[PDB]
């Protein structure tokens, strides 16, 4: 069925930017909370920040609030991650999920769908 597709991940020098995309391989008339998370070795997937159905309420994780910014556009069905002021500590495999319900999209369990995600890695 639906395939979620994350895009824009790179290997950047610290300090710079990123803006990942994450694009549906179809369209829902349903509200889908939607959410980014992240991997790295040694560790269980993060979550990162999301955005309710509507796109009006958003959450980031405390390493990155300030400095990510997540939105979404309908018209393109398409969720970004404007990564700014990166540091070594953001390098991850970066995916994207969509849930049902704005409160658990955070959560590892909480997503229905899930990307097989993009890497993103900043050198010092
Ligand atoms: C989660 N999702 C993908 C989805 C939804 N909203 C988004 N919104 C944005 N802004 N960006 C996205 N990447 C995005 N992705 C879904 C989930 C279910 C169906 C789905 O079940 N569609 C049925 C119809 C039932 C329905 O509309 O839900 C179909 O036949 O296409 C489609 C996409
Ligand atoms: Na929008
Ligand atoms: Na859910």
């Known amino acids: 069925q639906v395939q979620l597709v994350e895009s824009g991940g790179g290997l950047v020098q610290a300090g710079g930017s990123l803006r990942l995309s994450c694009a549906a391989s179809?369209?829902?008339?349903?509200?889908?909370?939607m959410a980014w998370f992240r991997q790295a070795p040694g560790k269980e997937r993060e979550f990162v920040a999301k955005?309710?159905?509507?796109?009006?309420?958003?959450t980031y994780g405390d390493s990155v609030k300030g400095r990510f910014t997540i939105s979404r556009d309908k018209g393109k069905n398409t969720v970004y991650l404007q990564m700014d002021s990166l540091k070594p500590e953001d390098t991850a495999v970066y995916y994207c999920?969509?849930?049902?319900?704005?409160?658990?999209?955070?959560?590892?369990?909480?997503?229905?769908?899930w990307g097989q995600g993009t890497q993103v890695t900043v050198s010092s």
């Open positions: 955005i309710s159905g509507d796109g009006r309420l958003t």
């Open positions: 179809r369209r829902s008339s349903r509200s889908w909370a």
């Open positions: 999920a969509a849930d049902d319900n704005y409160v658990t999209a955070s959560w590892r369990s909480g997503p229905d769908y």
